[PDB]
Every structure is written in C-alpha cells, then in structure tokens.
Nucleic acid binder design. Structure first.
Lengths: 116, 98, 52, 158, 166
RNA sequence: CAGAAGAAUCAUCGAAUCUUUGAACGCACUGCGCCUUUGGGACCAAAGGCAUGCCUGUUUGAGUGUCAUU
RNA sequence: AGAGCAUAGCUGUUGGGACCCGAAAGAUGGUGAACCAUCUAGUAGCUGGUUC
RNA sequence: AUUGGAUAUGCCAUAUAAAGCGCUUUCGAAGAGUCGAGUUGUUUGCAGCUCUAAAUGGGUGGUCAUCUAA
RNA sequence: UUGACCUCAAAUCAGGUAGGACUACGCGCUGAACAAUAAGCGCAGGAAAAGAAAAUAACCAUGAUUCCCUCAGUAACGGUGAAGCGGGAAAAGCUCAAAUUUGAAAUCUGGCAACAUUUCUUUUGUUGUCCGAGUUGUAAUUUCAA
C-alpha cells in the first residue's frame, strides 16, 4: 500500500478552479465566510490568537445581530463556544462591528398584498 | 478593513464572566408531572419478582440480606440503595393506607 | 520499474536564486554568449536593452 | 486491455468523443451584472476582487500575496460605515439605495373586515385604553391583545 | 399524554403486568409464522419514537430469532430480505422468552406517494439507502460496528505516502 | 466487384424496429398447455397475456368472531 | 566567547519481493484420492550463474 | 435549439394571516432488555448468556470540568 | 336479527416494486495459510461511509464530519503503535419522539372529472368531487442552541 503525489499540481488547480466557479455563482459576497478570533486551548499556544468556527450567541447579541439573520449575511454561529473572558467577547464583537461596517446589503423584493 | 490578524497575542488582560446556565445541562431534573406518571405506573405494573422478595425481607426485617439481594441483582450499591429506598417508600405508604 | 521512483529533486531556494542570479549575470558577458552558440557578432551592445 | 474497451476499438463505430478540455479558462461570471461587466476575463478572483474594491476573503490569507511592483468602552460605539475605495463599489452601493427606495412603503393598509373591526372598538372604548378594549370579549371576537390592537390603530391611519 | 405512561410501563419488563403479557404474547406469536405483518405496533410508543407514523407506506413486521452477530441486527437483515421492496427504517425489542427474541422492524414503502411526497421521509427514497439493514447503516448497525464519537469508539497505517519532493 | 445517381462499406440521431435464449416469467424444457380477445370457412388458428414475494388500494366471500340487537 | 540545518553525491549498514536461479509446501476456493485457480515475490546457512 | 440561477416588468395574492428581536408576578415534556454488573467468546469495542437500573440523573475526564446516549 | 367492528382468505382486481450485471473506489458479515490478510458471502453510489458532541481538555480554554501536514515512530504496549494540540483544504446546518388543534384531523394516498404542464403527445402537477387512510394520533407547533 503506497500513495504517490503526482496529482499534487492537478489537485491544486482543481481547487483554484473550484473557487472560481463559487465566485461566479455568488458575485458580490466573498468566497469565504468571516470567522472569529479565538485562542488555542492549551498552555503551549494559549497566548496565540487564531480563527474560530463561528460567533457565539453572546457575540451576536452584544454586537447587535439576531442569531437567525446572522446565518444569512454570512456570519456563522457556534452554539458550543462561550465567552468566559470579556477580552474574548471584546475581540469578537468588534470583529463583527468592523464587518458590518463594510457590508453592503442588497434589498430583496417583498410581497405586498393589496389588503392586510 | 475586515482582517484577521493572527499570531503573537491579542491581550493579557482577563475578566471572567459568570457563565449562564445551558438548558442541556438542565437534563435530569424531576418534572412535577413525570414524577406522578412514574409513581402511578409503579403502582399499576406491580413489582418485579426479585423486587417482591425484597419487600418481604424488609417486612421480615432482614435488611442486610435485602441489600445483598438487590446488589446481586442490580449491580452496584447506589443502584441497590435507590431501589431499597424506592421499595421502602412503597412499604410505608401501603401500611399507612391499609 | 516502479512509479514511486524519485522523479522530482529538491533544491534550497537560496541555491536556486544564486544559480539564477549567476545565470542573469552571465547573460551580460558577450563571450559567454558566443561561446554558447549565439550569433550576436553584430549586436550593437550587451546587455541589449530596448525601450518600452 | 479490457474486453469492453477493446471490442469497440476494433469495431467500426465512432468513439463517443467530447472536446471538453478547455484548460486555463476560468468560470465566466453570472449573477451580479455590475461585477460581470467590470470582471476582467483573464485575472484571478483574488486579483479581480481587489481591482474591484471587494474583499475576496475577510479572513487571513494563508500564503504570500503577489508583489507585482516594488511597493514603497467600545461595545456601544459603532463603526460609521466604510467609504468605497472604487467607483464600482459605489455602483453597487448606489443600486442598494435605489432598490431600497422603491421598497419604501412598508406600511400596510387594512381590509374591510379589520376596518369595521377597529371602528366598532374605537367608537365604543375611546382611543387610549387599549388594554381595556382588549379586555372586552363581546366585540373583541378574535380576542386580540393590546399590542396588536394598537398596531391596527396605527395601520388604519394610512 | 399516553406515550408518557407507555414509556414507564415498558421500563419494567419483569413486573407482573409485563411478565403476564410476556407469556401471553409470546405464546400467540410462536403460533404464527416466523415473519408476519402486524397491523398496529405491539409497542405504539416505541414505534412512534423510533420514526413510525400511522400512515400508509409505514409497515411493521414481527420476527422471532433463536437465542444462543447481534440478534436485533439479524431481525433487520431477515425482515428486509423478506420484504424486498420496503426500506427498513428501524427495529425494536417487543418480547422475549427462554428460546426466542421477538423483534418488530419498521419499513417504509419508497414508492408510495404518501411517502415520496413527505418532506421528512423523502431521504429514504434515494438509492444510496437501498437496504440499509445490509450495509450496517441502521441504529444497531451503527452500534454493532463501533461507530460514534468518543475515545471508546486500518489502511491509514500501512500506507507509505511518498510526497512528490521527498 | 455489384450497385443506384440525393449518392455515400458516410456522418449525425430525439422516431419506430430490435430472432431464440438468458435475473427469465404458463407448466415443463424439446414439447405440453390454460385463459381471454381477435378472427377463421361448434371447433380451430393467431395474437395477447397466464412466474413468485412484498407494498397501497378495490371487489367478493366467509370466522368457532366481538358485538350489535326487543 | 556555540556550529549546525538543508540539498546532491559516494561508500557502508538495516529493512523492504532485495543480485539472478533452484526445497515437499501449506491455506482458501473450486472441478470432475485426482485436478484446477489464487493468496504467493511462502520458506535457502545451500546449489548453479552474476556481463567492458 | 435545451436548460440554469439572477435582473427588469405585467398579472394574480386566500394577509382576519405568519415571523425575528424584546419583556416575562406563568411554564419548560428530553428516546429501557437500554445504560450498568458478573460471566463467556471474538478481535479495545463488539457478540451470546446470567441478571438488569436512575431522575440534577446519566456518560467521560480532572469534592470539580465538560457532555447530554440508547 | 339487521348491520357495524375485528380477523380470515381468494381474484387474469387495478398501481407498483424486488431479483441478475458491473465491482477501481465504498459499506457490512466472515476467514486460514503465508493477519480484520487473500478468499467466501452480502449491499450500494457518483462518490460511499462519517456528521452537527452522552467530543476534547485543565487552557486567556477550544467546538459537526472528512482528508492532508505535523504531533511521531512519540506516548502506551512489549518490535507493535496512536490521540488531543497546532497548521492547512472545506464549511451548513437540521428534522422527529416526549405538550390538549380540542373553539371544531386542521393531514394524506387512490378512483373519477376538467384544467394544465413537458428533454416529452413518452414528463410532472393543480383544482373539484367521491372513497379510503387516520383519533391506538395524520398536520401546525417545539428539539435543549432551547
């Protein structure tokens, strides 16, 4: 049982081509969703900062975005992560606020029945 | 400019927040309705054959063997302790009612 | 014959930049151009630069 | 090699060919017509998003971005938008305003049933004690609450 | 309302009510064929909570397997092979005795338009789910092959991945 | 070679055709049938179907049913 | 008052079918004690050979 | 020619309706021959057999943390 | 009695569906040599499986699964031999059971009638009515993130 990496330049170009069709389908929105900033859970890397999965419910409510719409404007949700330190709430709320600063939202046509 | 800046650190200043309660942690609370439902079915289904013999031992007052029998049948003391307390609750209630 | 033979060979980058900085340097010396077979006996000047 | 591959190589039937291989050609843009018009057909999406004033990824680039030329107390605060660095972003933003401008009438009128429904309540229980008029049941057939009765009162105005 | 009460009456399987029923039901089931249709589930609340809904296309078959591979996992392979067209949803214990285990197996008709048009049970019409009792993709199949999250739950070892530049 | 002059040992291809067999399907495996329809010129022939399990439904009847029921 | 790290080569060594050829096998599964096919590059201190 | 997701715009809308956030002097159901134990096979889990549970409980980790199976 | 309801059957009763083939990849059962190994058997797809924690961890804590790189030939075992961590690819979340709609089974298949519709006279629907399914519970609702 042996594996060869001859398709390594083939697979990389397939991935790039897979990104370009995604960009074609969804033009204005970025090819990647926003991710939060979290700290690795170990004494070795705890002083580091990296990306998370999504923004917890305290990070959404504090920033001012409901949890239902957040999934629609590209902000992802992590029901499992929680905020134990306020610096973790702060680094990710401002991460949301800077995102909503640059976020153009296209209006959608809405059904308007004659009566009500 | 939305941009993630990883590496080095972001901050050493810490402030713990008293975390709320998650509702999945709430599992295992005794609902007021279901306690009644469990009790009524316990009355209806009767008692297990081995568990019936435990009642007689308590009535005959060989509680030491009652623990031994339940422990043998169930598997651990805390499982046997709860059953004995479950059984003796039946016995006292039947004796006051009848 | 087995396909998992060693086909591609690693060279450190600083070895690759040295070999290519040297390669660029030797393209400005007319002798090393004739001696490679290039018919540049009438080229006005080496290194030969044109405008944009 | 295989029997199935080999019998149709000897036979006289033509091979079910497909001239599908178009290497190096990118996926043509559909969706937003504005960006399609300003989409260079040769540049990569990281290059075109940048040239168009859009972020391809709000998250950290995991690699080395191209250097073509030798380049020389707050939870209540809100980030006062981001000015567009390109015309094309302003084109996208301008359309957002106009689309919202068309969809401005979010107030709804009333149908006949709830129209006379609100008059019957209004002319009997005044116009201020909405809780009391929600407490009555003889006229409040559907048993609306105070909050929804006020909404109908506002909606009937225009 | 009721399936709360049926939940805790089924938790005591040696009480007199159940043991008296265990003898009565097992005697009459052995009188029948090995695999036979059942109109209403012998355990309505268990069938309910396992996915069964009282509507057309939902079927139940009761099977006895000799005691002495899992017994319940067997009941699913034998029922499905019997009803070749139905997709097996689930399975549950109904009864047992000294020489047999009686299992009920719920199946779905992939062709019935009450099912095919049901937004929630549509997933079973897809061919990838052909005979999930045969591949080990049911609940007991997932358990019997040790699939799950945990620390208590091959070729990645033997392989020799030689990268292009090595 | 023949061969016609919308030719073509051509291409395309969305319409029909697609022998006996084979999971192979009336029983058998050559034969023997059955049923219905079509007809021939009551009988015969041809055509159609006539394999099992299971699912949803329809009709028919029956159980030693449970009743219902004056 | 640190001298390594990385690449390429050479020779050496340990595995891998392991310089090449050669010991009854055995096992699984089939066919009509026999026979077939694979696992198999099963096993060697030994034999014969190993090229300007 | 055949389709795909968008835009533009015409018509029709059963809206007496349906949602999100908010506040709660009222509430909050949670998967059993399963978990678990002894014991026996298989290769730690899984399987048979013997028994067989609980409701801030139960599993797992370090009086705590995390999780919420059938 | 009638006749309901339950079971029992049959029919060339309508509408269906299953089998065999392929098997590189894939999911199971099972298996000796020389090792979840060949084989044997069973079941699938354009991928299969897995999957939104009865998951880690002891941290400033992380956060479905899958693959890659490292962790590492390390721990552990006794040569066999991992997993968190980290870094990448990709990302998306959800539906039931357990609630009395109870001021109204609100749910659904099938027959028939017209209306349509088409990769299509070969597809797939709606409206109306009738009959069944269903109160031993089909819709809405809610799934712990609440």
């Amino acid at each position: 049982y042996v594996k060869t990496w001859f398709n390594q330049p083939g697979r990389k170009l397939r991935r790039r081509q897979a990104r370009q069709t995604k960009a074609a389908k969804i033009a204005p929105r970025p090819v990647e969703a926003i991710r939060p900033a979290v700290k690795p859970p170990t004494i070795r890397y705890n002083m580091k900062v990296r990306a998370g999965r999504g923004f917890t419910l305290e990070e959404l409510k504090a920033a001012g975005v409901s949890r239902r719409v957040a999934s629609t404007i590209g902000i992802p949700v992590d029901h499992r992560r929680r905020n134990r330190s306020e610096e973790s709430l702060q680094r990710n709320v401002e991460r949301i606020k800077v995102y909503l600063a640059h976020l153009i939202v296209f209006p959608r046509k809405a059904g308007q029945p004659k009566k009500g | 400019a939305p941009g993630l800046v990883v590496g080095l650190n972001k901050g050493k200043t810490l402030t713990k927040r008293q975390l709320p309660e998650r509702p999945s942690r709430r599992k295992g609370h005794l609902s007021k309705r279901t306690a009644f439902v469990r009790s009524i079915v316990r009355e209806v289904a009767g008692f297990a054959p081995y568990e019936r013999r435990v009642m007689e031992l308590i009535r005959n007052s060989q509680d030491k063997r009652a623990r031994k029998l339940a422990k043998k049948r169930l598997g651990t003391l805390k499982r046997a302790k709860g059953k004995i307390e479950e059984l003796t609750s039946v016995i006292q209630s039947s004796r006051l009612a009848h | 014959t087995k396909t998992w033979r060693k086909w591609h060979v690693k060279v450190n980058q600083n070895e690759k930049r040295y070999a290519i900085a040297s390669a660029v340097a030797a393209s400005g010396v007319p002798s090393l151009l004739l001696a490679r077979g290039h018919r540049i006996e009438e080229i006005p000047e080496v290194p030969l630069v044109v405008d944009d | 090699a295989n029997p199935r591959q080999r019998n149709k190589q000897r036979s006289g039937k033509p091979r079910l060919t497909r001239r599908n291989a178009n290497k190096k050609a990118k996926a043509k843009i559909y969706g937003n017509f504005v960006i399609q018009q300003n989409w260079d057909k040769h540049a990569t999406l990281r290059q075109n998003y940048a040239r168009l004033g859009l972020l391809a990824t709000p998250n950290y680039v995991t690699g080395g971005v191209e250097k073509l030329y030798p380049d020389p107390d707050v939870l209540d605060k809100e980030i006062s938008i981001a000015p567009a660095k390109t015309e094309v972003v302003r084109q996208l933003e301008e359309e957002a305003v106009k689309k919202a401008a068309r969809q401005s009438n979010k107030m709804l009128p009333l149908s006949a049933f709830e129209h006379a429904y609100i008059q019957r309540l209004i002319n009997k229980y005044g116009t201020e004690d909405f809780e009391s008029m929600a407490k009555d049941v003889k006229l409040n057939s559907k048993l609306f609450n105070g909050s929804k009765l006020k909404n109908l009162y506002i909606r009937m105005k225009a | 309302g009721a399936y709360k009460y049926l939940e805790e009456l089924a938790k005591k399987k040696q009480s007199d009510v159940n043991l008296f029923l265990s003898r009565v039901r097992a005697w009459e089931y052995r009188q029948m064929n090995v695999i036979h249709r059942a109109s209403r589930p012998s355990r309505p609340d268990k069938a309910r909570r396992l996915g069964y809904k009282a509507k057309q296309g939902y079927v139940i078959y009761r099977i006895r397997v000799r005691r002495g591979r899992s017994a319940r996992c067997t009941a699913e392979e034998r029922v499905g092979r019997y009803c070749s067209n139905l997709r097996v949803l689930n399975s549950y214990w109904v009864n047992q005795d000294a020489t047999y285990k009686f299992f009920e197996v719920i199946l779905v008709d992939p062709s019935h338009k009450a099912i095919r048009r049901d937004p929630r049970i549509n997933w079973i019409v897809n061919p990838v789910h052909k005979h999930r009792e045969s591949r080990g993709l049911t609940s007991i199949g997932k358990k019997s092959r040790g699939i799950g999250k945990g620390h208590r739950f091959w070729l990645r070892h033997n392989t020799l991945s030689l990268r292009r530049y090595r």
